[PDB]
């Protein structure tokens, strides 16, 4: 059964073409998942499943749509009883030997217990905090005053075990409106300390986002 899903706006035909080119050349099976966008469909899904998120002013409707798309795919993993599901966003660029990882799953089956709770990142690791130089505040005694700025972890390419799909669905349902944060922050920052939940990183990675 197919394990690879690419989140893509149903009208984003040029992005879909980019995905098709890359995946078909490497003979990697996949399906598109129609992404949630600002719409009655997204609004109704938020109210049905995540009214906490519907009420969260701290997320943009785009960020809510992104969360909803991942969340519905986590649900798909559970509903179809998949050992794992592999999720992409439609701006990823695949590295050369992606087929060995994405067209076959026996390597995962040997390495992981899917009722255990893990996410394996396939995309490049991005530092969530970086130093930026600035101009307003002058240096002192030959030391610069830099600013700490936050960067989002990508959610553009990862494997999630059925265990983790269940965990993240329950987590997002249990969060209060005030506790909601963008999906990348919950998956890859906040929850890194959580006891049974483990995040792994393929290194070197096998894909990267085409944006920034």
Closest CA to 90 of 41, 160, 29, 157: 157
- Selected binder of its own copies within 100, 115, 116, 210 (CB under 8 A): 100
Kindly state the tokens that stand for 34.
Answer: 């129609």
- Residues in 49-78 that interact with ligand UDP by CB under 6 A: 62, 65-66, 69
Total of residues contacting ligand UDP (CB under 6 A)? 14
- Residues in 37-66 that interact with its own copies by CB under 8 A: 58
**CA separation, residue 151 to residues 53, 127, 158, 179 (Å):** 21, 7, 18, 19
Per rule CB under 6 A, is residue 184 in the interface with ligand UDP? Answer: no
- Selected binder of its own copies within 1, 31, 40, 178 (CB under 8 A): 178
- C-alpha–C-alpha distance, residues 23 and 88, integer Å: 12
Kindly state the tokens that stand for 79.
Answer: 């509903």
The label of the residue with tokens 């963008």 reads 182
Per rule CB under 8 A, is residue 147 in the interface with its own copies? Answer: yes
- C-alpha–C-alpha distance, residues 167 and 43, integer Å: 24
80 annotated as a binding-site residue: no
| Residue ranges that bind its own copies, judged by CB under 8 A | 58, 97, 100-101, 107, 111-112, 120-121, 125, 127-129, 131, 137-138, 140-141, 143-150, 153, 175-176, 178-179, 181-182, 185, 188-190, 192-194, 198-206
């Amino acid at each position: 059964e197919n394990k690879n899903f690419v989140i893509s706006i149903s009208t984003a035909e040029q992005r879909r073409n980019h995905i098709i080119e890359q995946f078909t050349h490497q003979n990697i099976p996949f399906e598109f998942f129609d992404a949630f966008t600002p719409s009655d469909k997204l609004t109704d899904h938020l109210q049905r499943y995540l009214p906490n998120v519907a009420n969260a002013a701290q997320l943009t409707m785009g960020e809510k749509g992104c969360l909803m798309s991942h969340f519905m795919l986590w649900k798909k993993c559970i509903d179809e009883n998949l050992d794992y599901i592999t999720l992409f966003e439609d701006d990823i660029l695949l590295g050369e030997n992606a087929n060995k990882f994405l067209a076959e799953g026996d390597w995962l089956k040997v390495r992981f217990n899917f009722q255990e709770i893990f996410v394996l990142r396939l995309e490049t690791f991005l530092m969530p905090v970086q130093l930026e130089k600035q101009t307003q505040i002058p240096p002192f005694q030959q030391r610069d005053i830099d600013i700490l700025t936050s960067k989002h972890f990508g959610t553009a390419g990862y494997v999630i075990s059925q265990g983790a799909a269940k965990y993240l669905i329950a987590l997002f349902e249990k969060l209060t409106t005030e506790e909601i944060k963008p999906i990348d922050e919950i998956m890859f920052n906040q929850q890194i300390n959580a006891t049974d939940y483990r995040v792994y990183q393929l290194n070197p990675a096998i894909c990267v986002q085409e944006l920034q």
